[PDB]
Structure 1
Amino acid sequence: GMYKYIREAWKSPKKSYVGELLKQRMIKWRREPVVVRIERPTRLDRARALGYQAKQGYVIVRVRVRKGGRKRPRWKGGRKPSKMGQVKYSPKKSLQWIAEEKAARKFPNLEVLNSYWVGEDGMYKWFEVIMVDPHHPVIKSDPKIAWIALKHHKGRVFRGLTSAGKKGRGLRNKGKGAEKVRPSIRANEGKGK
């Protein structure tokens, strides 16, 4: 099918036409807002695998974020040498998770279903976020996705229940080494991460 061909093309963009296409697309994207809804997903196979469907209630949002870690604000009170670092620090949430949260902030009435990497230059990184409308009858009538309509699935991205959130919390490991990651980070004194 076409999905395998798209996956093969996007395997390594620099080793196919996707490299030049991505360069031109990045040139176009650098001039667009940080968060922008798009008509169709760029990587159809990835969107479908993550749960996108061609029906009312689904939204694809491109989000641009800056690469690198973070610089801590200057400390005002006295500090011991172990706590004075500012420069060499990194966020504990992945940039994909951060972009998902930005998309969630932009769209308040939807829920973040998933996200995937779609390109990056030496300065920025681009993600495409699949989001769902829990109040649409078409979404409700679909047993595959209707579970988002329940009350306890509000702010799932913010609480860390997406794929990126699970990866950040370490829920992709089992057995040895995953002793402090379940049932939650807080439940283990917040020291498993």
Structure 2
Amino acid sequence: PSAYQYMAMWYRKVGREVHERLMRSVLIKWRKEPAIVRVERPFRLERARKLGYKPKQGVVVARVRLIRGPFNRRRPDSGRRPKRMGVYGITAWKSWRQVAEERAARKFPGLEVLNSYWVADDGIYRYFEVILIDCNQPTIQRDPLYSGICGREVPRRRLARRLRERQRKLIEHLKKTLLPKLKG
């Protein structure tokens, strides 16, 4: 049982009571800080590592604060049938997590968004942590996971030659070891 398993207990029922006391003091500073701020370390380390966070050069973790509730649906100012005139209760098909990802993407232009997770809620605001990666950094390009977003290419000669070489040697071995059993 890794330390990351114990880290999650503050967001489980066993540690929720102590954690909400911590958030009541941490949230005071966050409400005063800028709406989008870069952070040195993720607030939920175990959650961040699952979604692909690593402490490599070029990985950015940004904390995003935004107002909760349904989106600002606008009352139409022109003629509409009665079904299309309502306001209260109508929401967007986007969630605030995707909205928080897009806002973090704007502040770091050119960086790609990897993932994000929920952090905290208060009466007015919701807080997310967005993992963005620089696809131009050398230490990000060769990552086994980060090359899925930053692109990857292998020449066909590399895969075709080795697969051909494997098939030549497998057929040589199967003739001496599998052919007598098959014929028999």
Same fold (TM over 0.5): yes
User: Cα offset for 1:53?
Assistant: 0.7
Q: Does the 8 A contact of 1:69 with 1:89 survive in 2?
A: yes
Give the structure with the larger helix fraction.
Answer: 2
Cα contact 1:119–1:126 (8 A) shared by 2: yes
Q: Hey, what does 2:77 align to over in structure 1? A: 76
Report Cα offsets for 1:28-53 as digits up to 9, x if no partner. 10001110000000110000000001
Question: How do residues 162-181 of structure 1 correspond to structure 2 at under 5 angstroms?
Answer: none
- Of structures 1 and 2, the larger Rg is shown by 2
Q: Match of 1:35?
A: 36
In the alignment, structure 1 segments of 5+ residues that lack a partner are 152-193
Question: Retained in 1: the 8 A contact 2:73–2:91?
Answer: no
2:140 counterpart residue number: 139
Q: Secondary structure at the match of 2:32?
A: coil
**Residues 121 and 127, structure 2, Cα contact 8 Å, conserved in 1:** yes
Percent of paired sites with the same residue: 46
Q: In the comparison of the two structures, how many residue pairs are matched?
A: 151
Cα deviation, 1:1-37, whole Å, max 9, x if unaligned, reads 2101111122248734211111111111000111000
**Aligned residue number for residue 131 of structure 2:** 130
Tell me the distance in 2 between the aligned counterparts of 1:133 and 1:40: 17
RMSD: 1.7
1:17 maps onto 2:18 in alignment:
yes
| 1:62 CA drift (Å) | 0.3
TM-score relative to the length of structure 2: 0.77
- Distance in 2 of aligned mates of 1:23 and 1:126: 13
Q: How does 1:108-123 map to 2 (within 5 A)?
A: 108-123=109-124
The one-character-per-residue Cα deviations of 1:95-132 (angstroms, maximum 9, x if unpaired) are 11111111011111201100011101111100011111
